[PDB]
Design a protein around this motif. Structure first.
Motif, PDB file in Angstrom:
ATOM      1  N   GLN A  45      51.395  -1.781 -18.184  1.00  0.00           N
ATOM      2  CA  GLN A  45      50.381  -0.738 -18.152  1.00  0.00           C
ATOM      3  C   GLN A  45      50.191  -0.194 -19.560  1.00  0.00           C
ATOM      4  O   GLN A  45      51.161   0.195 -20.215  1.00  0.00           O
ATOM      5  N   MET A  46      48.946  -0.169 -20.024  1.00  0.00           N
ATOM      6  CA  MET A  46      48.654   0.278 -21.378  1.00  0.00           C
ATOM      7  C   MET A  46      47.780   1.517 -21.440  1.00  0.00           C
ATOM      8  O   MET A  46      47.843   2.245 -22.431  1.00  0.00           O
ATOM      9  N   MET A  47      46.973   1.778 -20.419  1.00  0.00           N
ATOM     10  CA  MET A  47      46.118   2.952 -20.386  1.00  0.00           C
ATOM     11  C   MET A  47      46.367   3.739 -19.110  1.00  0.00           C
ATOM     12  O   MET A  47      46.779   3.184 -18.088  1.00  0.00           O
ATOM     13  N   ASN A  48      46.114   5.041 -19.183  1.00  0.00           N
ATOM     14  CA  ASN A  48      46.303   5.927 -18.041  1.00  0.00           C
ATOM     15  C   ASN A  48      45.213   5.661 -17.013  1.00  0.00           C
ATOM     16  O   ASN A  48      44.102   6.183 -17.130  1.00  0.00           O
ATOM     17  N   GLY A  49      45.531   4.867 -15.999  1.00  0.00           N
ATOM     18  CA  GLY A  49      44.585   4.618 -14.932  1.00  0.00           C
ATOM     19  C   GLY A  49      43.453   3.701 -15.333  1.00  0.00           C
ATOM     20  O   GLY A  49      42.279   4.020 -15.133  1.00  0.00           O
TER      21      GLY A  49
ATOM     22  N   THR C  60      39.929   5.169  -3.866  1.00  0.00           N
ATOM     23  CA  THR C  60      39.359   5.696  -5.097  1.00  0.00           C
ATOM     24  C   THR C  60      37.859   5.899  -4.924  1.00  0.00           C
ATOM     25  O   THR C  60      37.140   4.973  -4.541  1.00  0.00           O
ATOM     26  N   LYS C  61      37.391   7.113  -5.194  1.00  0.00           N
ATOM     27  CA  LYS C  61      35.989   7.454  -5.010  1.00  0.00           C
ATOM     28  C   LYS C  61      35.215   7.225  -6.302  1.00  0.00           C
ATOM     29  O   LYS C  61      35.768   7.281  -7.402  1.00  0.00           O
ATOM     30  N   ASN C 111      36.512   1.415 -10.395  1.00  0.00           N
ATOM     31  CA  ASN C 111      36.908   0.013 -10.404  1.00  0.00           C
ATOM     32  C   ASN C 111      38.416  -0.130 -10.253  1.00  0.00           C
ATOM     33  O   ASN C 111      38.888  -1.006  -9.520  1.00  0.00           O
ATOM     34  N   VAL C 112      39.182   0.723 -10.922  1.00  0.00           N
ATOM     35  CA  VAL C 112      40.629   0.589 -10.995  1.00  0.00           C
ATOM     36  C   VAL C 112      41.285   1.651 -10.123  1.00  0.00           C
ATOM     37  O   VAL C 112      40.786   2.777 -10.009  1.00  0.00           O
ATOM     38  N   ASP C 113      42.382   1.276  -9.475  1.00  0.00           N
ATOM     39  CA  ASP C 113      43.095   2.197  -8.605  1.00  0.00           C
ATOM     40  C   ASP C 113      44.208   2.888  -9.388  1.00  0.00           C
ATOM     41  O   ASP C 113      44.263   2.835 -10.619  1.00  0.00           O
TER      42      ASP C 113
END
Lengths: 49, 49, 140
Positions: A45-49, C60-61, C111-113
Motif C-alpha cells: 500500500q502506497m497511498m491512503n485509500g 463505497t459510495k 473505484n477503490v475500496d
C-alpha cells in the motif's frame, strides 16, 4: 474475480477452504493440509485509500 | 461532516499528526496530545458494568 | 419544550422619558446589508467529501471512475463554478490548465475500496457471493 457467475469459483480457487466431514479421498487430502496459506498474505500500500 | 475523511481506507488509526518537510530533508512533526475523553471513559465504565 | 430535530436517526405615573428618541439621521458608511450579505456568503461551512467512503451497508459510495480523472474533472467543475460565480464566460481565477504540471494528483473516488481493491462488484455482493459459494441442502 469479476464475471456474472461467481459461485463455483471460490471452491475451485481455494481447495483448503471446504470442510472435512468424511473419510472420502478429497477430505483425506484436505485434512492433511496447512491452514494459514489461503488467500491474501502480502500487499504494498502506497497511498491512503 | 464528522469523522468522514478518516474513513478513506486504513481506519485502524492510533493518533493524528500533520507534518511537512523542507528541501533539505528536515521535517517538522506536530503531534497534538489528546486530553481524556468523556464518552470513551463512559464506554469503558459501562463495559466494566 | 418539545424541540424538533434536524435528522431522523433510529426512528426510520407620568413617564415623560426625555432620554431617547429614535427616528433617523445616520446612514451605514460601508453599508449594513452589503457587508452582512458578504458575511453570510462567507458563513457557510465546507461541503463534504463523501467520495470513496463506506455507506451504511459497507459499499463505497460515489461513481466508478479513475482517481486522477476524477481529480481533474473536479478541478474542471470548480473552474466552471468560479465562472458562474464571477458571472463571466470564463473564470479569471482558474483552477485547471495551470502552469503547474500536476499529473500525479489524486482525489478520492468510488473505484477503490478501503482494503485496496476495485469496486467493479460492490462489497456486499462480494461477501454474499463468497458465503453463498459454500452452502448445503437437505438430502432427498
Amino acid at each position: 474475480l469479476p464475471g456474472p457467475d461467481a459461485e463455483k469459483w471460490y471452491s475451485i480457487m481455494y481447495p483448503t477452504r471446504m470442510g472435512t466431514p468424511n473419510v472420502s479421498k478429497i477430505c483425506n487430502f484436505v485434512a492433511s493440509c496447512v491452514r494459514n496459506r489461503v488467500g491474501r498474505f502480502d500487499r504494498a500500500q502506497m497511498m491512503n485509500g | 461532516m464528522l469523522l468522514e475523511p478518516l474513513l478513506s481506507g486504513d481506519p485502524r488509526m492510533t493518533q493524528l499528526a500533520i507534518q511537512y518537510q523542507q528541501y533539505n530533508g528536515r521535517t517538522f512533526n506536530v503531534i497534538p496530545e489528546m486530553p481524556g475523553s468523556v464518552i470513551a471513559d463512559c464506554v469503558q465504565l459501562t463495559a466494566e458494568v | 419544550k418539545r424541540i424538533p430535530r434536524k435528522t431522523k436517526g433510529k426512528s426510520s405615573p407620568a413617564t415623560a422619558e426625555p432620554g431617547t428618541s429614535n427616528c433617523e439621521h445616520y446612514k451605514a458608511r460601508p453599508g449594513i446589508a452589503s457587508v452582512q450579505k458578504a458575511t453570510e456568503s462567507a458563513e457557510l461551512p465546507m461541503k463534504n467529501n463523501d467520495e470513496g467512503t463506506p455507506d451504511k451497508r459497507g459499499n463505497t459510495k460515489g461513481a466508478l471512475v479513475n482517481e486522477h480523472v476524477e481529480a481533474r474533472d473536479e478541478a474542471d467543475d470548480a473552474t466552471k463554478k468560479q465562472a458562474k460565480d464571477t458571472e463571466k464566460a470564463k473564470a479569471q481565477v482558474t483552477y485547471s490548465d495551470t502552469g503547474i504540471n500536476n499529473a500525479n494528483e489524486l482525489s478520492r473516488s468510488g473505484n477503490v475500496d478501503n482494503e485496496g481493491g476495485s469496486n467493479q462488484k460492490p462489497m456486499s455482493t462480494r461477501i454474499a457471493e463468497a458465503t453463498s459459494a459454500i452452502v448445503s441442502k437437505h438430502p432427498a
